[PDB]
Design a protein around this ligand. Structure first.
Ligand SMILES: NC(=O)c1ccc[n+]([C@@H]2O[C@H](COP(=O)([O-])OP(=O)(O)OC[C@H]3O[C@@H](n4cnc5c(N)ncnc54)[C@H](OP(=O)(O)O)[C@@H]3O)[C@@H](O)[C@H]2O)c1
Ligand SMILES: NC(=O)c1ccc[n+]([C@@H]2O[C@H](COP(=O)([O-])OP(=O)(O)OC[C@H]3O[C@@H](n4cnc5c(N)ncnc54)[C@H](OP(=O)(O)O)[C@@H]3O)[C@@H](O)[C@H]2O)c1
Ligand SMILES: O[C@@H]1[C@@H](O)[C@@H](O)CO[C@H]1O
Lengths: 306, 300
């Protein structure tokens, strides 16, 4: 087995990480660090520093805290000689991810920047179908009510919190995996409530290296049903990914998919990378979000209920 | 020797690029493309596509247009099989630069993202002195007046980072370790889309703090200074990289020859079959736009 610690036991750690870890036989959950939470059955620490000081035989760490603290935790873990798995986004900046990757590679440790939506069941079938087809246009719609999905959450509205790009980067992680050629931003518009530092809605217009337009709309003002869809117009008809990757239709006919197992897949891949002594750090989804903040127009909107 | 074309004949093409080229025999200036200017003594085209179609013995091209149009020109030149030299910054977005870099590497072609400030005379001596020494802190002071031009105030125009990135290209060159942004503040006037002033709080991979202030407002000081405090005293760079003090003792520097040095390195890159694409100064600015708190001030 491989000994594993989990840091920051909040929403996603309880809903997805811990169940996935238990079912993965290659990992033995050994310790957990969290300031306000405890995981029964394992040793518990209030912060990562104390966990790392006491858990010297521990092999790997998985971080599920907000991204603003991701660099410090990941650096501390790699400095102690642990393999590191990162929730998305892999960092608050691009420089800190490059620094962590160089650090991991010099120590021969595994760094894994995860993108859970890439493991949605529709992603690989869509990728295989699109590899050898003339793509004409790409449309992305990613809208959901923030108050139903992140109630009371505050770090999403602070610098480094991405705002609507926090789930929006899930769509971009899928888009950059299913399209055969790289993206480049042409324009962006970020809509920012006057009481927060991150956008609540955004519009991205990119093109692949052959000029295929890629239009994307993100919004956190929405009704109670999500719209998480990606539509790829092809000379053979439209490929339509919906429900965040759990539903796929090709040329108007539905495609049967295996059940959604995003986080088991992630942890199976984390284990494989450790065994191979390899890293997996793809920053292209965050690089595009950075280009949107760097190049995009910023428009103000009325305040949000925080 | 290497046949060369120049695209975008503006003032600094006239003032810096062409004199630098005419003074190094390693290059043969063969053609120039530009819509509103012609260069005596060589063939002239109004755009790069016409130049690339006509000049088929051409080896390389140096691009001097603004970065917003440079990406399409750089792509076309690389598909044509030409070595490419870029003015700074190497792109409007980091995605643009990554695409060019993969395209140049795919064709075995030389791609050179230049930072003319890195060729200032103080830069290499400062870097050689700091490589071995225990650095404690770094401060960057950049202040000037903007009223003594509209693309700078528009989405992707960078604002005060348009000149400010030159200081960042020297900082990232002389320091022995990479920088991570920990905090940034961008002060944007309410009638524009880019910062007039900004501060960057960074740390290197050893925790050394690196602070950088940029300001374009009216004020008492016209300032460009980089101060690196070490266990052996303060290394100080002033006058845009033309002046160097080590431990309070001034250091004698040669004359400014930024663009001759750039073109000499381009030729050496082509001879070695190498490229030189350092995007870290732009990656830092993008991190500031991504991670920085934004603050409003009165209209410009
Ligand atoms: N929720 C989702 O839908 C979802 C899905 C997939 C991925 N993700 C990603 O996974 C990450 C975590 O998301 P989340 O929904 O779980 O948010 P969260 O619940 O607010 O954060 C999880 C835990 O991180 C700890 N935390 C907060 N501030 C901290 C700080 N300065 N230092 C150390 N720990 C701190 C907290 O644990 P303690 O107070 O006990 O220390 C918190 O319970 C995010 O990057 C998110 O984007 C989220
Ligand atoms: O002065 P400068 O500063 O040295 O740079 C601007 C120069 O690059 C070229 N330029 C500006 N906008 C351009 C655009 N859309 N497309 C191509 N070249 C452009 C121009 O040359 P040309 O106007 O002669 O093309 C201009 O003289
Ligand atoms: O963080 C996002 C969350 O906002 C939700 O909308 C869907 O996927 C998660 O990764």
């Amino acid at each position: 087995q491989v000994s594993l610690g989990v840091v920051g036991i909040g929403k996603i750690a309880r809903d997805q990480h811990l169940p996935a870890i238990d079912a993965e036989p290659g990992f033995k959950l050994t310790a957990c660090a969290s300031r306000h939470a405890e995981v029964t059955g394992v040793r518990n620490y209030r912060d990562l520093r104390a966990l790392l000081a006491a858990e010297r035989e521990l092999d790997a760490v998985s971080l599920c805290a907000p991204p603003q603290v991701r660099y410090a935790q990941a650096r501390a873990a790699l400095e102690a000689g642990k393999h590191v798995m990162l929730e998305k986004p892999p960092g608050a900046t691009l420089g800190e991810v490059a620094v962590l990757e160089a650090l991991a590679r010099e120590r021969g440790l595994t760094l894994f920047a995860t993108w859970h939506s890439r493991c949605a069941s529709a992603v690989e079938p869509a990728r295989e179908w699109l590899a050898t087809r003339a793509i004409r246009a790409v449309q992305v719609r990613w809208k959901a009510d923030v108050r139903r999905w992140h109630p009371g959450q505050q770090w999403i509205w602070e610098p480094g919190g991405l705002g609507v790009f926090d789930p929006g980067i899930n769509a971009l992680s899928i888009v950059t995996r299913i399209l055969p050629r790289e993206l480049v931003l042409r324009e962006a518009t970020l809509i920012v409530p006057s009481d927060v530092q991150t956008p609540i809605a955004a519009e991205l217009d990119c093109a692949d290296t052959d000029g295929v337009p890629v239009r994307a709309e993100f919004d956190w003002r929405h009704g109670p049903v999500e719209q998480w869809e990606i539509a790829v117009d092809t000379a053979d008809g439209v490929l339509a990914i919906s429900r965040g990757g759990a539903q796929l239709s090709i040329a108007g006919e539905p495609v049967e998919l295996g059940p959604e197992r995003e986080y088991p897949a992630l942890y199976a891949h984390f284990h494989a990378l450790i065994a191979r002594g390899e890293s997996d750090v793809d920053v292209r989804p965050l690089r595009l979000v950075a280009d949107a903040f760097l190049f995009g127009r910023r428009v103000q909107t009325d305040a949000f209920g925080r």
